[PDB]
Amino acid sequence: SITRTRVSRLYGLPAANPNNGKEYYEVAGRFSLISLVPSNDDYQTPIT
Amino acid sequence: SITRTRVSRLYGLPAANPNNGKEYYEVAGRFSLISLVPSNDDYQTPIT
């Protein structure tokens, strides 16, 4: 809402102060990823 | 009145010390007022 105006009961998040003073927002979880490392005769697994 | 003068039994508030030591004069009550305040209730908002 925007006080001293005809705007109220309007949902969403604007760009004025999205963080509400919070230094950051934090999510937490797990990321699952499979690779195609071009390896060779079955030893010497690469890295990078 | 003002002792030692001819000014006696005069009616009125003299402006020498009107407050007479009081911190403030107070009056209580209610009051109603009409206005032409703005509102929608609740139109002009997004359709959803």
Min Cα separation A7/chain B (Å): 8
Q: Which residue in A2, A5, A46 sits closest to B37, CA to CA?
A: A5
Q: Which residues of B touch A (CB under 8 A)?
A: 38-40, 42, 44-46
DSSP state of A15: S
d(CA A1, CA B45): 11
Q: Do B39 and A10 touch (CB under 8 A)?
A: no
Q: Do A9 and B42 touch (CB under 8 A)?
A: yes
Query: B41 contacts in A (CB within 8 Å)?
Result: none
| Rounded alpha-carbon distances, angstroms, from residue B42 to A3, A8, A46, B37 | 15, 8, 64, 14
The coordinates were experimentally obtained by: cryo-EM
